[PDB]
Amino acid sequence: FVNQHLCGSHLVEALYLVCGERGFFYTPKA
Amino acid sequence: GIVEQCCASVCSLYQLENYCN
């Protein structure tokens, strides 16, 4: 995606660069 | 979460979309 498989909030910065406006839903929950 | 896949493999955009609304 980015050039290297580096772990961090950069893939949440990527979720703002894609979905942006709504925040994010995510999986297991109450 | 599927964002630990980006810490251990070739991170891809379908992993982002498939987690939003």
Curated annotation (Swiss-Prot), chain A:
Domain of life assignment: Eukaryota
Protein name: Insulin B chain
Organism per entry: Bos taurus (Bovine)
Lineage, broadest ranks: Eukaryota, Metazoa, Chordata, Craniata, Vertebrata
